[PDB]
Amino acid sequence: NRDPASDQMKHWKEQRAAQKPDVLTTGGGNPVGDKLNSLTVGPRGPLLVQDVVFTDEMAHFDRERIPERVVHAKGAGAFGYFEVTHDITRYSKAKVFEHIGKRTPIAVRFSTVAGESGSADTVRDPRGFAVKFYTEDGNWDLVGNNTPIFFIRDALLFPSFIHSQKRNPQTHLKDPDMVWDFWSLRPESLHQVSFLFSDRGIPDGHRHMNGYGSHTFKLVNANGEAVYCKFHYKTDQGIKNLSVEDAARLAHEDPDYGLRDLFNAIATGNYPSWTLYIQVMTFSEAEIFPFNPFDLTKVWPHGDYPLIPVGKLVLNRNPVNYFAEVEQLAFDPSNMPPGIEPSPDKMLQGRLFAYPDTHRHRLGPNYLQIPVNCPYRARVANYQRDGPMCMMDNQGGAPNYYPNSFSAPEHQPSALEHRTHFSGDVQRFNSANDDNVTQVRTFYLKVLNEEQRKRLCENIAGHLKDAQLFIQKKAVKNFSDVHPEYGSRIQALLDKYNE
Amino acid sequence: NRDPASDQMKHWKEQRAAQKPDVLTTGGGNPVGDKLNSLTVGPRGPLLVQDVVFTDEMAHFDRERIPERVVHAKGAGAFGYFEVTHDITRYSKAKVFEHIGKRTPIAVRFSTVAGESGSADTVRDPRGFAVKFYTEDGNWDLVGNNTPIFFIRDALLFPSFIHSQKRNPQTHLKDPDMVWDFWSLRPESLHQVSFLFSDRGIPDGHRHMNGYGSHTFKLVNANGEAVYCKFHYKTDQGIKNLSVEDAARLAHEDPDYGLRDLFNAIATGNYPSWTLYIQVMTFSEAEIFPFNPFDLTKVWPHGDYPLIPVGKLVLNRNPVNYFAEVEQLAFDPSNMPPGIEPSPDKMLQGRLFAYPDTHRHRLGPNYLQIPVNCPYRARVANYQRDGPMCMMDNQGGAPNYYPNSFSAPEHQPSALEHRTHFSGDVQRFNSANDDNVTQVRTFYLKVLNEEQRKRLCENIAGHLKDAQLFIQKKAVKNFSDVHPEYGSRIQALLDKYNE
Amino acid sequence: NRDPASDQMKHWKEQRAAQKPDVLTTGGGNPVGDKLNSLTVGPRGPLLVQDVVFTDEMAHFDRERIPERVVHAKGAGAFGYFEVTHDITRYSKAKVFEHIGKRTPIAVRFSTVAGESGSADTVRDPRGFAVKFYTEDGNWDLVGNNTPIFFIRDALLFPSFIHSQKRNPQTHLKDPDMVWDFWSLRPESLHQVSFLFSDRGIPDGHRHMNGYGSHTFKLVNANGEAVYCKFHYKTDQGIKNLSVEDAARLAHEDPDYGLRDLFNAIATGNYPSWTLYIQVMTFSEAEIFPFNPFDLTKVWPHGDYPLIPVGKLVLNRNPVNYFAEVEQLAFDPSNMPPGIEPSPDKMLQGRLFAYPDTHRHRLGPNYLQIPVNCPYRARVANYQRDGPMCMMDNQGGAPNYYPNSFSAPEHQPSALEHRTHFSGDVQRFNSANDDNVTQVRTFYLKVLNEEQRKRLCENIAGHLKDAQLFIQKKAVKNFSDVHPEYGSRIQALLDKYNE
Amino acid sequence: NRDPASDQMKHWKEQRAAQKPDVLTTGGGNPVGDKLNSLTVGPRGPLLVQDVVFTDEMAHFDRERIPERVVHAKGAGAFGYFEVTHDITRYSKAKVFEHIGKRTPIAVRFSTVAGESGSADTVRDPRGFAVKFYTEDGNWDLVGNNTPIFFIRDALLFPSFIHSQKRNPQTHLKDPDMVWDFWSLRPESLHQVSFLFSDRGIPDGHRHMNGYGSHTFKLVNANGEAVYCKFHYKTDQGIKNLSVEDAARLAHEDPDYGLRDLFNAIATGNYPSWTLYIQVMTFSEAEIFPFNPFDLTKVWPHGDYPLIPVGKLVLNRNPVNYFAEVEQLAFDPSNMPPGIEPSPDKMLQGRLFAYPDTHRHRLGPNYLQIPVNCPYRARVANYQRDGPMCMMDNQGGAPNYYPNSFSAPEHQPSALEHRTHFSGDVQRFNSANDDNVTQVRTFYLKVLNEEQRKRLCENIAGHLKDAQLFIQKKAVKNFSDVHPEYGSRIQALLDKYNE
Numbered sequence A, B, C, D: 001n002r003d004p005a006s007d008q009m010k011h012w013k014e015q016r017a018a019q020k021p022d023v024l025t026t027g028g029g030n031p032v033g034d035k036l037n038s039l040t041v042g043p044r045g046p047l048l049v050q051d052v053v054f055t056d057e058m059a060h061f062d063r064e065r066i067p068e069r070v071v072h073a074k075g076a077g078a079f080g081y082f083e084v085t086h087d088i089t090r091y092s093k094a095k096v097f098e099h100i101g102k103r104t105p106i107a108v109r110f111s112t113v114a115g116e117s118g119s120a121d122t123v124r125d126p127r128g129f130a131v132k133f134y135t136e137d138g139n140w141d142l143v144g145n146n147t148p149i150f151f152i153r154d155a156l157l158f159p160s161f162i163h164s165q166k167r168n169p170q171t172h173l174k175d176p177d178m179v180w181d182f183w184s185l186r187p188e189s190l191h192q193v194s195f196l197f198s199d200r201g202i203p204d205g206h207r208h209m210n211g212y213g214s215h216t217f218k219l220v221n222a223n224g225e226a227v228y229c230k231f232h233y234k235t236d237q238g239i240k241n242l243s244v245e246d247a248a249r250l251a252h253e254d255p256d257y258g259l260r261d262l263f264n265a266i267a268t269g270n271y272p273s274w275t276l277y278i279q280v281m282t283f284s285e286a287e288i289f290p291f292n293p294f295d296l297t298k299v300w301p302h303g304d305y306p307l308i309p310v311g312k313l314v315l316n317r318n319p320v321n322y323f324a325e326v327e328q329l330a331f332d333p334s335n336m337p338p339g340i341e342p343s344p345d346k347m348l349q350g351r352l353f354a355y356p357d358t359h360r361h362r363l364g365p366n367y368l369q370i371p372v373n374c375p376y377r378a379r380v381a382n383y384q385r386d387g388p389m390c391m392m393d394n395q396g397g398a399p400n401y402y403p404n405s406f407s408a409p410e411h412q413p414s415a416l417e418h419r420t421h422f423s424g425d426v427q428r429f430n431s432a433n434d435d436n437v438t439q440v441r442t443f444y445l446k447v448l449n450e451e452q453r454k455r456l457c458e459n460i461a462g463h464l465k466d467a468q469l470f471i472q473k474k475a476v477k478n479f480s481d482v483h484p485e486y487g488s489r490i491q492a493l494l495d496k497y498n499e
């Protein structure tokens, strides 16, 4: 035989075996006599408007496509569960961490960042690793990546960053001038750029990569006491990457390498797993941290803030219909149940708005009613009504204003957010200089060895060689600030490339 | 006490025993701690983006509205059943007519025509009377009106006719010049105009008016023999009309008079019903009919084509949530099950295209997936997939191309359409002069009495009086062609009006 | 001849006189041969898909409607100019106030609140009075009402209040229980309710009422000094209202009363104008104001904060096409040029988000590209691109990321917002008990005269009578809390109504 | 210094000499003070909703994407002109052919078929070659391909065909079982499958392939006489194809090979051109053609129906903004000016409906208002109005109903469609067995040589080898019907591949 993925139809047919074909109908449920020949006057005559079989089917075909995700368009999904294995109730009261052995269903979507829906999986790019927890207190979406950090630290630079990574607005071609002019002008990108151009830049499928929340988050316990945290979910299959050589080969031999790998792993029973950890920081410590605790361009040293086990994530089910279950999947960082709150991270703050907003556009106003997006483990009861494609019963005839004297849904005091104190002027504080090299120099010296640093520079130079000399100069100058050797090596490569 | 419509909330309240009210949540199912006070920095400080309770609720409120129907925007709905009382299987093989006593659930929506969603019920205008039969062979939508005829007989004049009935493109005001310039210029409208301005122009609610399929349709039997027909559903409540004075009064007194009437009636167990009849014309008869059997401005004389009893239409269930079950209702004339087909009526032909089209716009590509529009009494299976707001399971992993060797849905030759022969050039044949008066004269002097011919001419003059003199002149000419008296009478009234 | 509005087409034909009427075409610009008859095979044959003239027209007709505004759906628009008459330069550096006599084009839309698109103009309800200033520093949208205050003072309560003012979720009928239960439970609305049921409750058209920014705003001068302010625009044609009985008759005789009045006033050269004033309050004063200066339910006493003249608002141009210039008009309170900023008013803060949001839904992502919404006196230059229905050149080939070394647009520090210092815990502060009767007492006793007080209570009782008894009790209990005579006078009339 | 495409930004920067950079504004035209830092309370405080610069920008970024084309999603565009070189006014009265030398502006888009927006250009697949002619009689869209024929001859199988060529609905992977099951079940696909797997399957860029209307169309002269025709635009650059190995190389090295090649060619002054010809068939010859002349799987032998020269197509201008000028480009086969009409081709008949339909979904109801889609060389004037994103003036205050007595646009008899007669039963005539091998045999034996037949069979086997054996067998059967050796040679390859 061949892989399970390849036998998808063969298997569907087999699953039906005995049963005979169902009757083919129009969208309105009308049986059709012949869906292979159009209705005309005479065998060589005109098509009739009276052929509603044709119109019904073609019209739907004409409307199959929806906008792809503005970012992370190319992805793959699966479903499974989360199981608590350690008690962290001292930090969070979230019913999802409620007690060891507690399992909560989950939905996951892996993806690249820049490429469109037709792009290849095995290419250098960060990797999305979004997890949706269907908890009793509604859904909790942990929208992380395969890296604990990011290129920028203020949401205002996000649209620009993404544009620099995508296509030139006139030629529609990738543009090295755009990529590096941006990166060279914004030195804060050094930390994640180093990671991206390291071996971890091209993971071997979605099962051999780590997942992180990246953002500092806030956990609150049953006492009302809070602590800041970081979510870490390490791959139990272990880290494994593709050489720049195999990745290019797979890019054309099988652009859906990641998708195929995941589906087959699950179909064969080789369920992928991750171990979820959290490193905790107290407000006292946060106020002492040598760096901005909420600066997305920085990590919390494992030595000072050890990883603590929380539970395990297992994907043991492939989607049945990809469009309905994966393409329409929607993760909102703002989706947080009692016990988990956001931090002041400027990037996370912006994401609180961005996701539901883009989901209302890409999917629709009632996108939370799409099966895979419904918090089906909780009871949605509120004063929201109508909107296009209003499914279910739209909460029936329940009073639609609050407060009301007719017993409609009520407050839940115990669900109040944790109160924190803040003081300062309301202004746009520049964070462009919040130390852009310190942690990068260490990544470059302690995280990577001599051979890894070797590839790191070859990959950077291989891409940067296409940018204008003045951009290469600014670019090199930045790497040099991190460490003189960092810049010198790349400059050496560029001198050769520039021949 | 008060009527049931007024105690809607009182009943919702008392029908929940002492049941503890539900927990107020976000669209994502997250419990809300306080949804009466926004999140700010200090008692008099600015609002935070972090307040996702606010954004989640406001963003949905911001998207509650959807485009109202392009016509028939103001209406009311109710649900019930259809019940066969006579065997007409000799004429049609449609499963809905299967056997005596067979019941099929129906959905109904009554409406005015020109007024927008905020308009008054008690106004002069035809009345939409659409019936959706959820049959085993899919949904059958009989999209009728409270009149057996219409103003025009070609779909190309429909948007123009509707534009003339609505608002002036610049002032946004009703424009008697547009109304009468169009009717005067197109005399085929005489018949229905005569009906509209007679007492039946303003029914007393929806329960006291008849329903008509209006168009000539085609019924096919098991033997494959065909015949043409007209559907008639007479009110078992009796014909009742509102006086011009009472209607004007109710316009401001109760703009939703029809809504209330229907809801309270069903709420008090006073279920309105209609008796469905059909007229039958053989193909032979159609070849010799003195008029075009498919001319929408003509009725079939009951003296040659008597009403044939079929079944009963009963409404005994009010909607629970109006937006979900009524505003979202979509009737498509093209939704016809085996045994019922369209005739060459040009207006009907046009409608085969228009309804599904506007629904894909007004509601969305997958509107047939909205609960009320779903053919839940049939098994929908085809090769259509995806589209925005895709609920269900999108037919899982079933093969999506036809034909296929994997046991997916198969068409069924039993559902093939009856075959009619046609010969002719592909041209735009004129129908503007297909006898515009013959049947109108008989309606004026043979169908109406003097007591109401007086009322007919008054109503017409009361409206026509505001169009320019040249428009009135022409309009009067048409009324004269029907009958010199008809014209003269109207002219006299106008003469007094013009002072 | 009749009134201008009535002669709209007559006048269109006249200005066209002598000109050969344009060739009618498809949306694609192809000339049409006969748009009055469909293409069929034979006179009484089937309609052809080949009839693309029919489809092009019918498909656009089927897509004519867009969702109506979620609130303020029924309205009227006009255009004109804003003229600076006085110098408020020491307060605001905004270019629109630059020099005495300076003219800035304006767009204005008047409207009711609860009624949908087809509702009547002359009904009890607040009046929208939105003004868009097309300034060199971009558009400034002063989205005002005919009242200085509002029913609530926290945005979270807005969707509920509107829900209570519209239709019952099941019956689709107006529901006094919903209306008064909400008002009963939230007494902060007493001030606006009192204003709403006074004679001002039903203005004689839009030309005889004042406008107000309602909210407290912030003005900043060239030196960086800020003050808080209130915007008031009083009518130059004087306050004039319709009696309950007069408004009621007009409701059915001319539901577009306001529309007609405005169009005719302008068409006949009787341009309506308003004088814009501001009240100023220094930061020191806001600090000692008897109430929360940012509470939308409070006004600023004229004796302590005199109206300071600013300029004139003149409407001298009617819309040419209503849908394009009025239905499509979008006002965003967040559209504020340098020199004008928001205050901490919680309601206003919520509005900063809501309008752009609903506009992207109702109109589309690029609604600011619709002519009437375009800041045509400014040069839009930024890093935003694409989106559905992208017009113009989408900023051509300009670098689309910021920062960049290719001279694309640059931010301007002078446009930086004014820095205010805020301190406090981050939480949901209860504002439900922020003095709900003080100014209402003054309103009832000092502002109104026995004559007015009389029918103010009769207006209230006439509507509150339909609510359930327990609701009437609490409502009266809130009026008595204002002034015993207020609540007692209501009770007397109620007792009577309950026969 | 590099290729023009690579220097896009450099050239733009240089094009703005010393001109000062524009001021950065919000969508509403308000200058932005600092677009690089968000508005927060203190340097490490929360984000404020008051930051309307952020929300304005992010909200638009969140809405950048629109559905990609259901098919032909990956493509490139350019602009230029059409020039008449020969006189064919004896066949067509279309203004575009009016006289020798006559120049008419054109827009062109090249594309692949199955791949999504991120897919590679150098892949085996047919190639789209749509040409939009902006004529005075409106736009004429000749939506062609790089092949004169297609896989199927009835539109009802188009959605299925495209589905079979796309991703598996469950695994989201290309599925050879789907591809070959469909093809093996529909042998009519043999002709185009043979052209597809030949050298032609992978042209070298877009400048080295021919164009074809594929369908048989109808031309009508000034005397009302009509002939059927075929459109052919041969590349003046000459046919040039990519080796299977070089295609897989560019597939990963430059997924945008075709995009780059075209832009550079035009940028460097090396304008690509095509010579336009027509094949003509009288109605008499049509009656005697050995095959259905309207059969899309058939070509008209050049020996019997010689190519007649008409003019040249030249592309001399690159788009400035790709999204606005190419991504939003909409071609409707139904856009045909007088003198050019459709034939009875069942496939073309379906396309008359599908394109404007999908465009109203992908782009919007008023997509014909997007600049690149407007028929700017004509005057659009009709009775269509409103719709979302209505630009310009919506035809102002012009009467909106037809007919009318107010001088609004009038139809033109000279534009009536040609008259053709048809007689026959209205039914679904089976065309599945309309000779599926005769011309395919001629192609395999006469058009190709041994060298080419060898590659053809290798290419087919290379893909077919991955489908199930039963599918392989049925597929080989069909090839054997074309020619015993055709099938045998492939079988030989298969046996090898099958291990």
Ligand code: HEM
Binding pocket: A068, A069, A070, A071, A072, A075, A109, A110, A111, A127, A128, A129, A130, A143, A144, A145, A150, A154, A155, A156, A158, A212, A213, A214, A215, A329, A330, A331, A347, A348, A350, A351, A354, A355, A358, A359, A362, D058, D062
């Ligand atoms: C200023 C900050 C950011 C903004 C405004 C932003 C915006 C977006 C948007 C608009 C989408 C598309 C959502 C959809 O269409 O469903 C997206 C997807 C995604 N983003 Fe971000 N993002 C930001 C930072 C990040 C960071 C730091 C991470 C990781 C912690 C992240 C991980 C992802 C992932 C994995 C997805 C794909 C989710 C899926 O598979 O459905 N984003 N982002």
